[PDB]
Structures are given as C-alpha cells and as structure tokens.
C-alpha cells in the first residue's frame, strides 16, 4: 500500500488470491475498479500495466482484461509476492527455492569450472575479507551463485538467478545471522575454488549437493523454532 | 511500435541497448522524454512502469529514474526482447536456451518420476493423437516440459519454464516444421513414459541428455542454412 499505486496493486493481487477476481475470469471494468479501490483511473492503469507484466493479468486492445492463472503466466518475479500472500506455505516455498539453487547450480558451476575457470575464481575470491555479518553474507552468497551462473558462459542461468534474488537474499539475511551458516558457506566457497583449480569433476556435483544438504539442515533447524 | 505505448517502449529499449540512455546512468526527465518520443505523459508513465517491472529501469518517488544494467536486474522475461535486439547473437541465445531446458529438465523430470509418477504420466500421455504440425508440436513440447516441471512437486521449476515460454515456443514453431524433429520428440516422450513406469534412474539423465544432443543436432543443421 503506502502510495496510491502500491495500495491498488496490493488490493488487486489480494483480490485475485482470495478469489474476489478469480483466475480464469474477466477483471471488472476500470471505472468500477477505480471507484472500488479509491484511486484515479491513471493510477489504476499504471498498476494494471505493472500487474500485466508480472503475469497476473492479460491486457488487450478492444478486449476485456483477463485475470490469468498466474501459475501459468508468471515467472520468478512473483516469488516474493507468493511469500507474502501465503505465510503458512512459506516454509515449503523456501525449501523449494533452496533446492532449485542447489540443483541448478550443480549445472552452471560445473560448466563455469570447465569453460571459464578464471572468471569462476574471480567470483569465489570475493569471499575474501567479507564482513562477519548476516547482510554482508546474504549479498556475498547471492553474488557468488549469480557470478558463477554467468561464468558458465550461458547468461540464461544468470537471468534465473536474477529472478531468484528477491526471495533468495531475504532468506539469506535471516539464515546468515547464524554464525555456523557463515562458516559453512566460507568453507564451501574455498572448496569450490580448490576443485576449480584441480579441474575436478564428480567432486563438484557431490560437493554442491552436500552443501545444499548441510546448509539445508542448518536452515531447517532455525525454521523449526519459528 | 504500432500503438503509442508500443512505440514508446520499443524506443526506450532500443535507446538503452544502443547506449543513447546508457545502463548505469539516469533516464532523461519525463517532460523531455515524452517530447522526444512523441507520446503523452500518461502514456510515457505507463510505459516506464512496464519497463521497470521488466528490470530495464528503477523508479523511486522523489528520485531520478535509473537505467539499470538489465543483465543484473532482468529475468527470463527479457529473452524475447534480447532476440529482437541482437539478431546476430540469436543463434547462440537459442543454443543457450535449449541447453538450459535440457539440463534443468534432467533435475525436475527425475524428481517428477520419483515423487509424482502419476502426474508425470498424465503429462506425457498428452502426446497421444497430437496433430502432425509444427504449431501443435511446439505447444505440446512446451506443455510437456512445463508439465513435468510442476509434476516434480517443486513449482519453482514451473515458474522457470513459464519465463522460458515465449522464446522457447518461438524456436519450437520453427524447429518442429521439420518432420524428423516431431518424430524424435514423440520417441522421447514415449521413452520417458517407459522409464517412469520402470522407476528408472541413471537412464533418465542419460536419456534426457541424449535427446538434448540429438534434437540440438537437428536444430543446428536447420539453423546453419539461415
Ligand atoms: Zn520474470
């Protein structure tokens, strides 16, 4: 909410989620919607355009605006919104995002080590001198996975990490408040550097999967308390 | 272009890409920009909001609008735009997207077969009676990969496929114009069904990688002529 546009956007998303405006149906006319929400038509139009780009709506000239099935039309951009809309399902959403990070990274880290080890090493070296605090590590960690994704030579993995950033770093800012989380991560970045230097193979997959499991354990034990 | 908003959006993206409005700098004032493009301020605002959601810009109240480094702020949503902006790099972009589909699917197809084989089988069965035409196969193929992504039980893989849809199906509509491409795909869906039924393991990874390589060969030989 806050600003009129912010309030309108949140109102419409909440209305779609709670089925006031069910996915699969037509959105109410602009005049009725603006009057219902309490914003000007120009403010509403700007919000509708934003929602359309995020996949919540489909807008077409000379045609009623449709409320989409966002599970079919939205991308990673809605992760943060999903976390806000369904608090009870947040634990599972987080586990799912961490699993995606682990498994997709096995692919691009292996490729990065083979195709651009110099870039991979530069990325991993950023862990040096990192501040021993949650916010610093949350950003460092995200930057390392995103950096390795681009270091693969296939920027599409980078675009995927870009979409994951919002919720991924949010998790990180809480996860890395745990000193052990920071320690395990540093050990991981250091091991990855060694594997890259040695031109290792199977060890990369096993090392990344192991990190996902161990970091996942630390997170789960933190999550269980909340 | 076409509509005023369409023209304005294309103009701004082209200007960012060609460094008229360099990433890392501030976007020209709205009054100047609307006058330069030839659209109303309201049309411009709607376009700016759309561009911001796609990651091209960062808009903040009481602060100049920044032109972002889209490689850092944009997600899969920009794939189609990238293809239109850099024709010479399209062949590589396509190869990269196909590689992502292949490698990420090894993960979610394996998971789907283990966690929800019934859902995986339902998805694969949609290949039955499929029309022997490019458009039909492009949609079927995308629906099968997206379907298996959701069948994994981790919807985030589905969100990734959602973001890939635009460019992925565009490739498909051309790729599947080749009768052999359609045949190889049907053989693949049928083999996947058999592997799911048998509760196969290593065969899944090997089969998916093989399909990526063989379909990639067919596509490359088509691409080379263009
Ligand atoms: Zn997106």
From Swiss-Prot, chains A, B:
CoA binds at residues 95, 99-103, 209, 215. Its main location: cytoplasm. GO terms for biological process: fatty acid metabolic process; negative regulation of DNA-templated transcription; positive regulation of DNA-templated transcription; positive regulation of fatty acid biosynthetic process; regulation of fatty acid metabolic process. Residues 211-226 are annotated as: Binds acyl-CoA. Induction: By growth in the presence of long chain fatty acids (C14-C18). Gene3D superfamilies: GntR ligand-binding domain-like, Winged helix-like DNA-binding domain superfamily/Winged helix DNA-binding domain. It is found in: Cytoplasm. The N-terminus binds DNA, the C-terminus (residues 83-239) is responsible for dimerization. The C-terminal domain binds acyl-CoA. Multifunctional regulator of fatty acid metabolism. Represses transcription of at least eight genes required for fatty acid transport and beta-oxidation including fadA, fadB, fadD, fadL and fadE. Activates transcription of at least three genes required for unsaturated fatty acid biosynthesis: fabA, fabB and iclR, the gene encoding the transcriptional regulator of the aceBAK operon encoding the glyoxylate shunt enzymes. This is Fatty acid metabolism regulator protein.
């Amino acid at each position: 909410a806050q600003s009129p546009a912010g309030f309108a956007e949140e109102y419409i998303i909440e209305s779609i989620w709670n089925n006031r405006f069910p996915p699969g149906t037509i959105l109410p006319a602009e005049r009725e919607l603006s009057e219902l929400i309490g914003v000007t038509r120009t403010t509403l139009r700007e919000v509708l355009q934003r929602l359309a780009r995020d996949g919540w709506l489909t807008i077409q000239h000379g045609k009623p605006t449709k409320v989409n099935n966002f599970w079919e039309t939205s991308g990673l951009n809605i992760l943060e919104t999903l976390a806000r809309l369904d608090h009870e399902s947040v634990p599972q959403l987080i586990d799912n995002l961490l699993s995606v990070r682990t498994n997709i990274s096995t692919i691009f880290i292996r490729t990065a080590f083979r195709q651009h080890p110099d870039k991979a090493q530069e990325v991993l070296a950023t862990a040096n001198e990192v501040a021993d605090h949650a916010d610093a590590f949350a950003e460092l960690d995200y930057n390392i996975f995103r950096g390795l994704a681009f270091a693969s030579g296939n920027p599409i993995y980078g675009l995927i990490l870009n979409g994951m950033k919002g919720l991924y770093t949010r998790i990180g800012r809480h996860y890395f408040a745990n000193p052990e989380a920071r320690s395990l991560a540093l050990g991981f970045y250091h091991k990855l550097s060694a594997l890259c230097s040695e031109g290792a193979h199977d060890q990369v997959y096993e090392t990344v999967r192991r990190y996902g499991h161990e970091s996942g354990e630390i997170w789960h034990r933190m999550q269980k308390n909340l």
